[PDB]
């Protein structure tokens, strides 16, 4: 059964971690045709290392590959180094540039190590930020969509105090979040999705009874999106709309509104998609696992599921 | 199977609705011993009416009853009247006063009709507010706990703008909410609960990276609760802790944090418990059903489940 129905870039993550290993393990399970659709970005030495541990030398031949994040020294499985940190960011940057340019349709980034990246002197708050830099966009014009248990939830704000989020919220920012999420839905295999916008305040403010914010922010936003031809319900109380389960995309105003449901229904298998300017990037749901790196016992189910998600048939 | 292990007050709700009918139907399914623990508050005429339609006159004898919300005219099943609206509020007020005074340990309110109550010139936002008035407490000193799919979630703030809730939050307010919820856990059959406190900010502020609020409010609150002998984890990110499902009580900081999960896992079969002073009050999850009122088609499963919850063995 085929799962890859488009061209993907696979950035192999921290080359001292399990990233390289899970990359090979995942690709091995795909057919030849499927493998020809996945271009692997990262240092070749890391991949040779993982091949020898995993007995997958045969596979390296049939691998489309672009050298990125080359190492100046041998691979040290399980060690945190700035060298590995830079490699990580260079591989992901290459993958993203390939997607920006149209050479691939999406990017999957294998696990990084924040310490590694930090020690290299590189600021990194997440894949949202990274994606912003590379494309030269504002950090807040890149959005996180969680996907899990059939729920797709884009977040208009993310990793800041609730106060800070509320101060930042505006009609335009919501419109941008939806625009990004709707295009992403095309990739995922839902070309014209039915959208629901969450209320900032409880029950979407109940007119103005529980706040003015929804009347100033979410209501204008929805009316514009409707006048531009989009099918959008709301603002409605997050709690209520989610329970109905009659929409393809939900638009959370705050981190917890979208994160709580996803993690409740999918405490392991949720994908996190950073989306900006025609680039969709998903991390893999776990860390670099330095404790097991290079012992060849890492599961590549998560990565495979991530490939199935970004690879869906239109 | 016994389900009533303590003294309960049953306010029969709108006397033109199904409240009277489901009251009799529920009580009928209980044993004699169980019935002696339930004191029914409401007009006797409504109960005679429901008996005669449902052929349950035998039961009225063995019913502990206090006249409340008497009607000045015959019962008109299926009609919305201010008379029925007042009856509703008087019955519930009596039930609550019986709980306040220590005559019963909890209160169950059968369905009301908002229009009925409104036409009587009575303000009514919900059972939390009503409970506040009757006891003469501030609306913010009463807490809503939702119960459903194994989850019990008390809310420290409720029905106000997110900004307003954040402005209200304080160590003491959290401690109060927990104190109320923990006593309620005793009633519900969980003497020594394991508690988890949600973060105000995403990831409980991530030290102080995503705000100072958790270090000012939730962290102090937890340390006090621990020093007073409670087993309390957190503050932790709402999303994360909920997914673990290793706690008996969760403490939401905002409406949506607690409401989203409950409604998602239990779009029916969820209880709403208003708790203030020693009083625990639950609604039934449905309306007065004027379309069927007095046609003998109402099920009392929902009410019976509500009795099982507030009636649980210590
Ligand atoms: O699961 C989270 O709280 C989360 C953490 C991140 O670093 C990035 C996106 C997320 O959704
Ligand atoms: O579930 C809700 O949003 C809700 C609505 C109300 O009208 C009263 C209490 C609640 O908890
Ligand atoms: Cl009375
Ligand atoms: Zn997060
Ligand atoms: Zn509500």
UniProtKB/TrEMBL annotation, chains A, B:
Mg(2+) 1 binds at residue 203. 3,4-dihydroxybenzoate 3 binds at residues 203, 263. NAD(+) 2 binds at residues 114, 287, 299. One of its GO terms (molecular function) is 4-hydroxythreonine-4-phosphate dehydrogenase activity. Its EC number is 1.1.1.262. Zn(2+) 2 binds at residues 159, 255. The keyword Phosphoprotein does not apply. PANTHER family: 4-HYDROXYTHREONINE-4-PHOSPHATE DEHYDROGENASE, D-THREONATE 4-PHOSPHATE DEHYDROGENASE. This is 4-hydroxythreonine-4-phosphate dehydrogenase. It comes from Comamonas testosteroni (strain DSM 14576 / KF-1).
């Amino acid at each position: 059964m085929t799962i890859v129905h488009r061209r993907l870039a696979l950035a192999i993550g921290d080359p001292h971690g399990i990233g390289p290993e899970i990359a090979l393990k995942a690709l091995q399970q795909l057919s030849a045709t499927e493998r020809s659709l996945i271009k692997v970005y990262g240092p070749w030495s890391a991949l040779e290392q993982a091949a020898q541990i995993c007995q997958m030398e045969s596979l390296l031949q049939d691998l489309i590959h672009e050298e990125a994040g080359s190492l100046a020294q041998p691979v040290q499985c399980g060690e945190i180094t700035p060298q590995a940190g830079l490699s990580t960011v260079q591989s992901a940057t290459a993958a993203i540039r390939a997607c920006e340019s149209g050479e691939v349709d999406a990017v999957i980034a294998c696990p990084h190590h924040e310490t590694a990246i930090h020690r290299a002197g590189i600021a990194f708050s997440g894949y949202p930020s990274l994606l912003a830099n590379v494309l030269g966009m504002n950090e807040d014009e890149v959005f996180l969509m969680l996907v899990g248990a059939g729920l797709r939830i884009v977040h208009v704000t993310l990793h800041e105090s609730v106060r800070s989020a509320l101060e930042r919220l505006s009609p335009q920012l919501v419109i941008n979040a939806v625009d990004a999420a709707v295009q992403t839905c095309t990739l995922l295999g839902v070309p014209k999705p039915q959208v629901a916008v969450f209320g900032i305040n409880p029950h979407a403010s109940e007119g103005q009874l529980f706040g003015l914010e929804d009347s100033q922010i979410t209501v204008p936003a929805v009316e514009t999106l409707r006048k531009r031809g989009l099918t959008v319900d709301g603002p409605m109380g997050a709690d209520m709309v989610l329970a109905q389960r009659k929409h393809d995309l939900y638009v959370a105003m705050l981190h917890d509104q979208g994160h709580i449901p996803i993690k409740l229904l999918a405490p392991n298998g949720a994908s996190a998609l950073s989306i900006g300017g025609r680039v969709v990037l998903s991390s893999v749901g776990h860390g670099s696992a330095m404790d097991i790196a290079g012992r060849g016992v890492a599961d590549a189910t998560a990565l495979l599921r991530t490939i199935a998600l970004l690879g869906a048939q239109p």
